Every structure is written in C-alpha cells, then in structure tokens.
Design a protein around this ligand. Structure first.
Ligand SMILES: Cc1nnc(-c2ccc(-c3cc(C(=O)NC4CC4)ccc3C)c(C)c2)o1
Length: 349
C-alpha cells in the first residue's frame, strides 16, 4: 500500500534504514550470517531476523545472486523452510534502488547450538529429522537443491520446531579446506566433483546430521578432503563397478580405484544402542551411489517416524520457474528484475 516511514541507525559501521514497525535492532550471528539483525516487528508481534544485502548490484554475479535469494525466499511457503515475512528498500524509484532488506522469522538458535548444549532423546532425534525431511520434501518438490545442509543452517526455536535456511545459494576452496564443519556434511560426489550431482546430495547430509544427533559426535570429521573420503569409505565401503561407471570424472574415477577395497561396515556395531529403526534409516540415507539413496518423500513414510508421519500434512511446493539461472543479463537488468520482485511482494496471511 502506502510507503511506511523509515528511520536510520548505524549498526556495526553500517547504516540501516528500516520501516518504523521494526524496533530494537541488534546485530546477530557474530558476523556468521552476513549482515543480520534481530528485531521486534511491532506490527505482527514477531521476533524477526533482518538481513541487509551488502551493495547487491556491484557485479553481474552479485546482482544475479541478489535476485536469486529474493526469488527463493518469495517462493518458499512451508513450516520447516525459511520464508519471507517482508522485503523492503528505502528507495522511492528504480533509479535510487541500491539496498535490499529481507525479513524472516527469528527462530532463536541453530542446531549446532542445540546438539552442543543439550541432551537429545531418540524422540528429539525423530522430531528434528522428521522436520528436516518434511522441509526437504517441499524444497526438492520445487526442483531446488540445498547442497549445503548442515547443523548451522537449521534454525530451531525453544519448542524444537525447525526451519531450513540457505538452500539453493551454493563456498571458496579455502572455506572448504582442512578440519572444517563446512565440508563434513557434504556428499562425496559433490566433495570430489565425481559427476553432475542432484537433490540426492541433500539426503547424505541428513544422514550425517542424524548420526551426529544420535551419537553427539560428527560422523565424518575429516581433516581434509582425502581424509574425509577415507572416513566415508571405511563406513560405507569402496565403490563397486556400477558406481565407478557413473563417476564421469575420469580423474576422480582413476584415483578412487587406487584405494584398497573395503566392505560396508555393520551399522548396528557402529551405532551401538541406537533405535534399530534409526540404524535402518541411516543405512538407507548413507548410500554411496546417490541413485540408490532414500528420497525425502520415501523417508517420511519410514517406520522411524510413525509417531509424526502424516501423509495429508507433508505438502509439496507450487512450480518454481528457475529459467533465469540459464540467462545471461546485464547488471541493470538483474537489478530491475529484483526491483519488480520487491515491489510486487505481498506479505503472508
Ligand atoms: C539465531 C537465529 N534464529 N533464526 C535465525 C535466522 C533466520 C533467518 C535468516 C535468514 C535466512 C535467509 C536464507 O536462508 N536465504 C537463502 C535463500 C534461502 C535469508 C534471510 C534471513 C534473515 C537468518 C540469517 C537467521 O537465526
């Protein structure tokens, strides 16, 4: 409708200009999330997170990624998936449009914080993984791949309710180097660029996360890519003939064949004392050949989630047109598209 009144403040060397409805902005994440503040939305009574994009139209790559994040956020309407509460710019025209602010729920913590600082019963694990899978079914149904699912991008409130963050944005080589959580959840096919990957990479990550919730320990805490691969192959076995043929990277194929063949281990011996149904599901997620991993929709129907599974309450997404991903456009063209998306935004019911 009408343009709200905006007010300005400096928050860590940066000037935030936001509608009056948003009060008590304070930075959050310790830099980790980007440039993000928590706030109180006096209009809804919700605690919100506000991300200010940093000079978003500085290159074609920045402009396109700004548009991509906004498109993604606008599309996602699911309880277990972060969605857009509001998007604004103080700009009164396309000519002056140069900052984008995205508003979402503030859950209050991430899973990293939880699995570090609390004791998780088998029931907690069931509920947390059920929700990630319910969110992923939705995401994958729109032909979106997370690609970087890990504890730190699972946002969780005090009732253990969960929303997935950061899907579809796909890190520098440096960030993925060494003993780092940034690589510990990645499917091997993506870690070592074995082949054209798909949504199945996300299921590997869920297996890694679920294992960690059950044991309180990182499943594959490799010191580097090669050490991580060795940790992985020790648990799930070395690839067989069928999978080797699917590694299109002649280079990666050649290297993996240099390794001594190892059989898949007994998961009941690896996950001592765990619910046999949890062990069964982990076996179905942690399959080296991505073609053979359980899908999110298949997983929701697995006996481990009998207590939460409701097939009438696991919605899919409306079609997501991502044809823009193949498009080469100028900065001003990506910017104008982003502007149209800001201007046309209608807040949720
Ligand atoms: C703590 C705590 N509790 N909740 C949060 C939190 C919630 C939402 C966000 C958030 C996520 C995306 C995102 O996932 N974009 C990609 C397109 C998907 C975009 C904007 C925001 C504010 C952030 C950074 C933190 O932090």
């Amino acid at each position: 409708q009408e343009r709200p009144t905006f007010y300005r403040q400096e928050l860590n060397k940066t000037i935030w200009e936001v509608p009056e409805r948003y009060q008590n902005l304070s930075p959050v994440g310790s830099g980790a999330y980007g440039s993000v503040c928590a706030a109180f939305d006096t209009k809804t009574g919700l605690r919100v997170a506000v991300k200010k994009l940093s000079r978003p139209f500085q290159s074609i790559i920045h402009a396109k990624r700004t548009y991509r994040e906004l498109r993604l956020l606008k599309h996602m309407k699911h309880e277990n998936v972060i969605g857009l509460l509001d998007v604004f710019t103080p700009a009164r025209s396309l000519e002056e449009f140069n900052d984008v602010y995205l508003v979402t729920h503030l859950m209050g913590a991430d899973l990293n914080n939880i699995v570090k600082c609390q004791k998780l019963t088998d029931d907690h694990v069931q509920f947390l993984i059920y929700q990630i899978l319910r969110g992923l079914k939705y995401i994958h149904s729109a032909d979106i791949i997370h690609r970087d699912l890990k504890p730190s991008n699972l946002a969780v409130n005090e009732d253990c309710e969960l929303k997935i963050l950061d899907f579809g944005l796909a890190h520098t080589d440096d960030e993925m180097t060494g003993y780092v959580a940034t690589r510990w959840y990645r499917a091997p096919e993506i870690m070592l660029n074995w082949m054209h990957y798909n949504q199945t990479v996300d299921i590997w990550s869920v297996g890694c996360i679920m294992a960690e919730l059950l044991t309180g320990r990182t499943l594959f805490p490799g010191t580097d890519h090669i050490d991580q691969l060795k940790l992985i192959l020790r648990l799930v076995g070395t690839p067989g003939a069928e999978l080797l043929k699917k590694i299109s990277s002649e280079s990666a194929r050649n290297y993996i064949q240099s390794l001594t063949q190892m059989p898949k281990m007994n998961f009941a011996n690896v996950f001592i004392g765990a619910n046999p149904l949890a062990v069964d599901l982990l076996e179905k997620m942690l399959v080296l050949d991505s073609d053979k991993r359980i899908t999110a929709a298949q997983a929701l129907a697995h006996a481990y989630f009998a207590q939460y599974h409701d097939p009438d309450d696991e919605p899919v997404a409306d079609p997501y047109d991502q044809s823009f991903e193949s498009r080469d456009l100028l900065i001003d063209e990506w910017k104008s598209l982003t502007y149209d998306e800001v201007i046309s935004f209608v807040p949720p019911p």
